[PDB]
Design a protein around this ligand. Sequence first.
Ligand SMILES: *[C@@H]1O[C@H](CO)[C@@H](O[C@@H]2O[C@H](CO)[C@@H](O[C@@H]3O[C@H](CO)[C@@H](O)[C@H](O)[C@@H]3O)[C@H](O)[C@H]2NC(C)=O)[C@H](O)[C@H]1NC(C)=O
Ligand SMILES: *[C@@H]1O[C@H](CO)[C@@H](O[C@@H]2O[C@H](CO)[C@@H](O[C@@H]3O[C@H](CO)[C@@H](O)[C@H](O)[C@@H]3O)[C@H](O)[C@H]2NC(C)=O)[C@H](O)[C@H]1NC(C)=O
Ligand SMILES: *[C@@H]1O[C@H](CO)[C@@H](O)[C@H](O)[C@H]1NC(C)=O
Ligand SMILES: *[C@@H]1O[C@H](CO)[C@@H](O)[C@H](O)[C@H]1NC(C)=O
Ligand SMILES: *[C@@H]1O[C@H](CO)[C@@H](O)[C@H](O)[C@H]1NC(C)=O
Ligand SMILES: *[C@@H]1O[C@H](CO)[C@@H](O)[C@H](O)[C@H]1NC(C)=O
Ligand SMILES: *[C@@H]1O[C@H](CO)[C@@H](O)[C@H](O)[C@H]1NC(C)=O
Ligand SMILES: *[C@@H]1O[C@H](CO)[C@@H](O)[C@H](O)[C@H]1NC(C)=O
Ligand SMILES: *[C@@H]1O[C@H](CO)[C@@H](O)[C@H](O)[C@H]1NC(C)=O
Ligand SMILES: *[C@@H]1O[C@H](CO)[C@@H](O)[C@H](O)[C@H]1NC(C)=O
Ligand SMILES: *[C@@H]1O[C@H](CO)[C@@H](O)[C@H](O)[C@H]1NC(C)=O
Ligand SMILES: *[C@@H]1O[C@H](CO)[C@@H](O)[C@H](O)[C@H]1NC(C)=O
Ligand SMILES: *[C@@H]1O[C@H](CO)[C@@H](O)[C@H](O)[C@H]1NC(C)=O
Ligand SMILES: *[C@@H]1O[C@H](CO)[C@@H](O)[C@H](O)[C@H]1NC(C)=O
Ligand SMILES: [Zn+2]
Ligand SMILES: [Zn+2]
Lengths: 892, 892
Amino acid sequence: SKAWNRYRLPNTLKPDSYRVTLRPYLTPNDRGLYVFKGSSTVRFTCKEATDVIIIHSKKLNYTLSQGHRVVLRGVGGSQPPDIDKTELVEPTEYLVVHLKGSLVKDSQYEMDSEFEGELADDLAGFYRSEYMEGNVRKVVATTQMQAADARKSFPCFDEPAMKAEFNITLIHPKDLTALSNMLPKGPSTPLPEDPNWNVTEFHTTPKMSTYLLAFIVSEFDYVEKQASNGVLIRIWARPSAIAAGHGDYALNVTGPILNFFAGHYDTPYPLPKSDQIGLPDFNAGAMENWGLVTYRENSLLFDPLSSSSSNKERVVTVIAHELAHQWFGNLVTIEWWNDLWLNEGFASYVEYLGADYAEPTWNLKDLMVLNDVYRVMAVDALASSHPLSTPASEINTPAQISELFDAISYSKGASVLRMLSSFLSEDVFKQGLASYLHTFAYQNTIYLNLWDHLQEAVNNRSIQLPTTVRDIMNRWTLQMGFPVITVDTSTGTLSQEHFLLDPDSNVTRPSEFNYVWIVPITSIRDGRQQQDYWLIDVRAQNDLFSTSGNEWVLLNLNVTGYYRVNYDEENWRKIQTQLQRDHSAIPVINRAQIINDAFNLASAHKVPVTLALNNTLFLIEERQYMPWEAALSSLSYFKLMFDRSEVYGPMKNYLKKQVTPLFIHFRNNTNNWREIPENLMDQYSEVNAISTACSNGVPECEEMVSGLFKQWMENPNNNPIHPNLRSTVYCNAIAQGGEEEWDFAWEQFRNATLVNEADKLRAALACSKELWILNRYLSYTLNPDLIRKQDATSTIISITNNVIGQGLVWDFVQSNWKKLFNDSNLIQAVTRRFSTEYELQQLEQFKKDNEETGFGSGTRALEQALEKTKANIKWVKENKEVVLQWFTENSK
Amino acid sequence: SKAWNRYRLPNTLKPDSYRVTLRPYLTPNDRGLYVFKGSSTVRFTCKEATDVIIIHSKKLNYTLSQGHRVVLRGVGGSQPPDIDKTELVEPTEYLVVHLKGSLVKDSQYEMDSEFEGELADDLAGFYRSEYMEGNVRKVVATTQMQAADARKSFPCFDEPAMKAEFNITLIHPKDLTALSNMLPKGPSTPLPEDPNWNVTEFHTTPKMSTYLLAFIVSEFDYVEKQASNGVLIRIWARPSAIAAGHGDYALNVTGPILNFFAGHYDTPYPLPKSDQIGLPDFNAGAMENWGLVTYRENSLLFDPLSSSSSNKERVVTVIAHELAHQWFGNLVTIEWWNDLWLNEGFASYVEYLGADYAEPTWNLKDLMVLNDVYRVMAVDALASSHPLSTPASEINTPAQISELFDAISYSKGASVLRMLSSFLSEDVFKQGLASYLHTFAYQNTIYLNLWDHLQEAVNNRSIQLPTTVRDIMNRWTLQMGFPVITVDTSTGTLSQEHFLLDPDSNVTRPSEFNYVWIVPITSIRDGRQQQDYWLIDVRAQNDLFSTSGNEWVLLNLNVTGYYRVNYDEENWRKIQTQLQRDHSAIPVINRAQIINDAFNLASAHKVPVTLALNNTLFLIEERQYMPWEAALSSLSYFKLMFDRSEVYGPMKNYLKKQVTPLFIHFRNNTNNWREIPENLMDQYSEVNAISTACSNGVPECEEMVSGLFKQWMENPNNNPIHPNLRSTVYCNAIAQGGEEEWDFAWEQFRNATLVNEADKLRAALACSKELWILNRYLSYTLNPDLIRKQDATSTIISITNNVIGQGLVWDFVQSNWKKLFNDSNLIQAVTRRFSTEYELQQLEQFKKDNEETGFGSGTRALEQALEKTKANIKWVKENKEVVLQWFTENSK
Ligand SMILES: *[C@@H]1O[C@H](CO)[C@@H](O[C@@H]2O[C@H](CO)[C@@H](O[C@@H]3O[C@H](CO)[C@@H](O)[C@H](O)[C@@H]3O)[C@H](O)[C@H]2NC(C)=O)[C@H](O)[C@H]1NC(C)=O
Ligand SMILES: *[C@@H]1O[C@H](CO)[C@@H](O[C@@H]2O[C@H](CO)[C@@H](O[C@@H]3O[C@H](CO)[C@@H](O)[C@H](O)[C@@H]3O)[C@H](O)[C@H]2NC(C)=O)[C@H](O)[C@H]1NC(C)=O
Ligand SMILES: *[C@@H]1O[C@H](CO)[C@@H](O)[C@H](O)[C@H]1NC(C)=O
Ligand SMILES: *[C@@H]1O[C@H](CO)[C@@H](O)[C@H](O)[C@H]1NC(C)=O
Ligand SMILES: *[C@@H]1O[C@H](CO)[C@@H](O)[C@H](O)[C@H]1NC(C)=O
Ligand SMILES: *[C@@H]1O[C@H](CO)[C@@H](O)[C@H](O)[C@H]1NC(C)=O
Ligand SMILES: *[C@@H]1O[C@H](CO)[C@@H](O)[C@H](O)[C@H]1NC(C)=O
Ligand SMILES: *[C@@H]1O[C@H](CO)[C@@H](O)[C@H](O)[C@H]1NC(C)=O
Ligand SMILES: *[C@@H]1O[C@H](CO)[C@@H](O)[C@H](O)[C@H]1NC(C)=O
Ligand SMILES: *[C@@H]1O[C@H](CO)[C@@H](O)[C@H](O)[C@H]1NC(C)=O
Ligand SMILES: *[C@@H]1O[C@H](CO)[C@@H](O)[C@H](O)[C@H]1NC(C)=O
Ligand SMILES: *[C@@H]1O[C@H](CO)[C@@H](O)[C@H](O)[C@H]1NC(C)=O
Ligand SMILES: *[C@@H]1O[C@H](CO)[C@@H](O)[C@H](O)[C@H]1NC(C)=O
Ligand SMILES: *[C@@H]1O[C@H](CO)[C@@H](O)[C@H](O)[C@H]1NC(C)=O
Ligand SMILES: [Zn+2]
Ligand SMILES: [Zn+2]
């Protein structure tokens, strides 16, 4: 009941501005520690009389000044009380300054601090990243503040609605460049006590959130170009990468995307520059720090001679995502983390608009169906999912915050925005967004603020909707999950219900909306688009959905809406007949839909599993990427359920049959692998045909990959494998080979100069079929001299995806949990095969054994794993015989 | 405290003779059950007045007669009390007849019973075995009584010291032959109620134990020959096997071995015939029933065109073993099961004398070192081992009895007899045994009775020993374990201590002998045998064991003694120098000894592990079977400890290097696999070279086995693989191949006509590297339509030996224990890889979870698994780095 034991800051104090001086030491001290020393003054306003200053502080040591950890001074004549004592409260991460009296309402004060922290290799706060240039160790001081680590670099009111201006000074070796959000204010000057160091002050930032600050000291090089909106773009990276031209693609796209967004939203980018910088050690994909956007090397750099088309797509989309955040996150910021989707849903959707602008021939916007809609529907069909906007009172700790950086906030966020754009029209949507951005510039928002501005646009344009934007969109935002819409084409009746993969699962989170949605329904009849419809009730009838004779209908054209569709068996049969007659008559995205929806419906007991399997029969003559990818994504579940069972042979036999003609088509079309297709989707289709053919035993594919890899081994400096094919050739050559192939690939990995090439090798090494080799590799993932800490969990996950790595990794996780934790994606990956009572009991015991240690940001993933495991046991029992028989009877 | 709740029969009643009539029904009844109906009268003597008749009865249903389950009558004027009531007490397996008064001391009585039981497919008591002749189902009624199942066929005083004569009548279909211990008494007559059945009475048996009775009804055929001692031998088997000539080898050897034993022990076989019969369904290897010896088909039948030399050796040794029992077990019988070694140790040793007689060119007696001494030293180095003669009061239940049919009773029994023969001389030994057999014919013995007769021979021959036979041999019989004898060749000092694989293990069983032995020590100096020595104390000094200059000594010539030997490092170094200079200077058995002892000493921390590994270096030029087999046996532990670890590659690389020249030698010597070596040991050496080369990655071996198997697949009716090579070619071709090879081998298995061929295929199928295939195969082992119940556990063990089958089988055992148990070798096999705290905790939880179900005859194996797992964790921690480095540095 003491304020310093509660996780949210009091509302009594609100900062105005800060100055911060930080000095990283890039050589270890006598104790072998890398440290930084700093000072700060924060000016703040008392909003309500209080005798305590509660401010965030994490892993900082204070130098005493005038008898206490801090000094408190008046501003504009205020006369603050004396300090009694200070304390550091570790759980809530506060410095608590107990005062001898109360501060005065609507008065200002300043607090000065002098402090020191570790420049750790922990990827959080002010931290160190390392690389080698030949035999010379290069050490970089860099930052990652989001969500709650700005407090690990200096004391601050570290919540996103506590916006302030920041005056940053970096003291650094004179040979190294200091970078921050803003440009330097005047020249750098020698430090008086030691002229081997420079003092670099930066101009004051705009009013902004603490989680967006960045401080970097390095000897990076850069390329640069003024963008057409007058903003300076620089791409910074290790000197060898810049000299090799690997920053050139980022330079080609960054300024043009930034200018595109500024124009599209009628809202200028207000800062003089936007630096993009690639770090050797970085936790997430990238981070949108305002003026100094940071990236993993693999998300920013690109080598036209060794990076794949998929890598190129990653670069432009991640850049577009980070640039989208300059508007959705930086200029306008979430009030609190519970509404994270206002940042992340927007950036995840808007990234495709930016990438499409930069690369108009690629057709990327379409991939959102796979990358966003279907990615998130897997978890959002669980009773243990969570709403897009969780109630703010439930999100308090750093672990609970971290947990929200998930498929819901990103991918469901993007999907619901895609749907909204569709029913408003994009022109009306962007009009409402321009108004939103203008109104809340330099401020913070909740979900209701967005609806108000979209409503203003709807009202201006006289768009008629069945109710207000707020009431439609609250259904998609405040309750978890999504509906299945079931059509009876005999009568034209539609109904909706909350779609649950397990009908038996226990939804315990109440919804004031009763898990009923207001649903925009598009549709086609025999390939022709019909009038749009709004389903407002649990059930309705309309002749739009009635058919007679040979006619079929499909709902959700191009899957713009966040919902699944079921039909009566007769309409499904007509759809299957269409797929056999001329599959091109159904839009490509809807061919993906038919497959993906039917597999999920089968899990939920809404269609027979043989109906979903029958929907894959036409794939033998499908050449498009997307329907194959949707099928392989759904069948991934079958592999997880069955790859340790009698069902697996027939399953592989079936996939071998379905993919062989496609594999042969590509063998011929590429002139025996000499060329790659012109169209991006065809390039992806080719990779999937190869991967699928090889995984399922097509002998020509096994011969091809082993032959190519052997040719590379014989000529290591002349890699004969096209970059697009490397991941799959490397993985399958390692799977088909033995110790000699593995060791070759490991040495290539250790000696890698490109992160893209290292990443492909690192995944490939997990493809060994030999248990002893997987165990040895597991031991390397934990050694930061061998595999970078940023990549440890990724590599462990690659091992667990291998059927032979399953028991290995699960036993390792159970055995080492305390050590791993104390010193989410992992839980999800290691548990997804579970389909037995034995495994369930292990998982329940794992929860019990580690309840005290806690599961931190993996807490919800554990609940979800328990729910899925229970569903899987029942699903396997119900389906194993029918599935075995189906694959056996259809694979010949 | 009621006698009927105690496991041992009272001493109040002792049977004299029995008549038993049994009638099996070889077609199912209306309820689908196969049943047998029977009657019995037992005549018994009251030794002490009692008002209860406690007699064994298991799974029998009684037909009421004169108002009770049985009728009690007087003999020779006795006048028994009326019966009050009877009860069946299931735990102790008794029929309990409560009387209205007491029986009279030294009077006789008769008890009549009429009963019915199931002719189950459970391999115990009177049971059914099944085979197909074309499409016609053949059903056989057959028996297995040992230890405690005679009571499952008729009520009896079912303990081995309750000897009696038996008068057996079988009522059977007129077309089927009835067989029992004795020959028929007069002609068979039609059953009056139904002339489709014959009534066959057999002559009275000698006085004998209930566990030796046999009753068989079949349409088997036979071959026959009168043996030179006038005894009729017949070999009986399914008609197709006999017609094919597959009983001919057994006929060649059986009579001659029987006559050899009768001559050797100066003790005639007293019965008119000895039938050998091979059953399609049979639990153990064979069973020595007096006059009607039963066998698995794979232990009796032999096909010169498809069976291997190893199979041939199995046939002659198992026949010799069963014939040895006619003297050691049947004529003279253990008093109680605690002294089982008096039957099984003798048969296990004497089998080699008989087999050597029949096949004098094979040199089999030598293999006892591998098959007996080293087989048992593994378990007898645990604190949880047990003495050869366990105290009788500890052995009470059928589970505790069953448990004693183990490596101690068989192999340690044989080893201690080998040692005894060596120090007495065989001539003195057999003189004492002839006296033993003469004195105790038709009676029962304990271990002390044997020593008394051996002493009589020693006394007659004036053999001088350091004490009596009893006092020497009690050290080897009444306490578990064996000594390590450590020699300091600097001073000629020897000492002994109880050898424990884990120095930290807790020996809780006290020994009145303080784990000190009296040890006969043979020795050689530079290849020349020295005078024998007796170590009587914990330590001694003698110049026999002192060396100077270049001389070396070795103790335990040809490993006649049941002990391990360690030396000072200097003598070990001279031994290693001898192995490098001219390994032929050390007797072949002692080359096996040097290897095997050093590996075990290394586990016990008595020598560095690198010393044991260094002792294998000379194997690169070793061509003899035995030292290689001893090395591979010891290295099996390294494989179990390391085949899921980084150590395994270097280990395989080392074995590949060591075996390649031998593999190439055989490739050349056999004219590229066209021929097999003439000498039996060389034939075994060839198989081991192939197995080892293929398991460890010799490319010429992988090519050879895959090529041969493919050639067979292309010509299924013309198998190109020599029988000696089939097990290893089949296993490695399956491991190297995929689903197509596996499926070919499975269909060959299902269609097999020879048990020998089926057995090789059944083992080979467990060699798949694909987890899904092993899981599918696991599901077949449990289906009695696919794999015979007699072979279920064997096949499961083959799966668990595969590194990929480890997690599979262990999880299966944990998950299905209650079901498996309620509806020992398995425990030992599934746990032998355990070397981690994680696995230990699983094992401890497994014990806890199933404590109530109990572990029956697997109880001691579980205690041993716990002890070994704890030792393994420590051993891996202590040795993994040094072993990794050694294999890496020595494999190049
Ligand atoms: C971070 O740097 C900025 C920019 O230099 C500082 O803002 C400046 O602060 C000064 C001193 O407070 C402002 O002048 C004063 O304004 C007050 C009204 O609040 C007036 O009563 C005084 O007479 C005086 O003129 C100045 O306007 C302001 N400049 C800008 C552009 O806003 C800021 O204080 C720095 N913060 C910290 C903690 O160092
Ligand atoms: C199993 O069969 C044997 C052999 O037929 C039976 O042994 C025979 O039993 C009879 C009747 O007891 C013996 O004759 C009797 O001997 C007693 C002395 O105990 C004497 O007082 C009577 O005057 C009478 O002669 C006969 O000697 C004996 N034969 C042999 C060779 O031992 C045995 O009884 C049968 N057991 C059962 C339970 O059916
Ligand atoms: C902060 O102080 C603690 C406690 O004295 C010390 O262990 C730690 O090393 C200090 N951190 C730094 C970066 O100096
Ligand atoms: C360091 O300061 C000097 C002036 O004192 C300036 O010329 C130089 O460019 C600065 N260098 C860096 C890397 O900040
Ligand atoms: C960047 O654009 C230039 C000019 O259009 C082009 O030549 C170059 O290939 C582009 N670089 C990359 C890496 O795509
Ligand atoms: C709506 O129209 C009003 C009045 O013309 C205008 O001022 C306002 O900016 C418009 N809002 C939106 C969201 O278009
Ligand atoms: C799947 O197709 C088969 C073969 O045409 C058909 O018999 C079966 O009914 C289909 N399954 C369903 C659920 O319609
Ligand atoms: C490792 O990479 C270096 C530098 O990029 C290259 O020169 C060399 O060929 C590679 N080393 C090996 C052993 O292949
Ligand atoms: C013995 O009786 C029990 C109980 O009535 C019955 O279940 C069982 O089938 C009987 N056994 C035989 C072989 O008839
Ligand atoms: C059955 O009995 C008859 C005499 O009744 C006899 O001739 C025949 O050999 C007997 N057969 C068998 C198999 O016991
Ligand atoms: C049995 O002995 C005969 C005669 O010596 C011999 O010809 C035959 O090969 C032997 N049979 C077997 C199966 O060894
Ligand atoms: C020992 O000798 C006695 C007297 O000659 C003889 O009767 C007895 O059978 C012999 N015993 C043994 C075991 O040789
Ligand atoms: C094993 O042999 C190596 C190489 O000759 C030697 O250095 C080492 O001492 C030996 N190990 C032992 C325990 O003697
Ligand atoms: C199975 O064995 C039979 C009878 O021994 C043989 O005739 C036939 O060739 C085998 N069947 C197959 C399919 O190989
Ligand atoms: Zn983002
Ligand atoms: Zn035996």
